[PDB]
Design a binder for this molecule. Sequence first.
Ligand SMILES: [Cl-]
Length: 315
Amino acid sequence: ATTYGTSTSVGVHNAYEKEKYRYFADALDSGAALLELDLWSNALGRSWRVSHSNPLGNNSNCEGAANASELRTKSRDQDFAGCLSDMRAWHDAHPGHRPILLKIEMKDGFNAKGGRGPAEFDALIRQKLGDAVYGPGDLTGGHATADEAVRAGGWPSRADLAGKFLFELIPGTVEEKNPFDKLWTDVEYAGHLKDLAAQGKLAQSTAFPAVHGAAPGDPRERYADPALRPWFVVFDGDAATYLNGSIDTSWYDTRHYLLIMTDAHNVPPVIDGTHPTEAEALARVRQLAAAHASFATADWYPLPSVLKTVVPRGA
Ligand SMILES: [Cl-]
């Protein structure tokens, strides 16, 4: 049987977009293993916005359903709390559902000073999803760090993660463009986990920060503070880059780290990001699995059968 660390599965980028999925419920029902959401924390006023582009209100397929009977009924363009409500409603209506990873790009990083930092992020997810989350506290157990835990014992079996949501955080594109040196999402959230762990409060955490940007060796060497490094057990980078010869991807599989490969369609020879043939997409997923991906992501909403695919990771 596979574990969350020994399988390869498929994700949909920007799954909150109405053009892909009329309602977020449709994204949840797609069978995809990974659904990506773009969040903004530094817009004015309350709420985490959900939007591809600079937000004006929100632009999303989330409806803030109160229960499953309300799915596919309400006005959309709801915020992050709205998406989380859809998830809870859908969750309750699908006992034992496949585990789903919500990949969160914090477009503009966190906004601690405005009440939208790591702690508030966790608190909101706890409020909306409660026991349905498998977070760093769950993986880490009695171990000193997430890294120690995952290397020694790996992830639970996929069967055991039935009915669970997981969260991945990456830094955002706007964040990468800041002329100043405000801490990025990755270091900020990893530091939050480190501080929680030191305080004996890792249980209240809700998300795994990822190292974003494919790189050779141990990508966590990019962080000057070695104390932050063992809180990163997820890595997220360009598929073609991972396959270009410069990176030993077996390293991730050996250590049971999750490896998300983005723009899976751009691996040569390129295939369509949205409407490839089923055969093309499946071959691509198998290729990336052999290359030790945990997830292959693209825009393949027209191919739910492919989105549902789960195969052995590596060999
Ligand atoms: Cl594992």
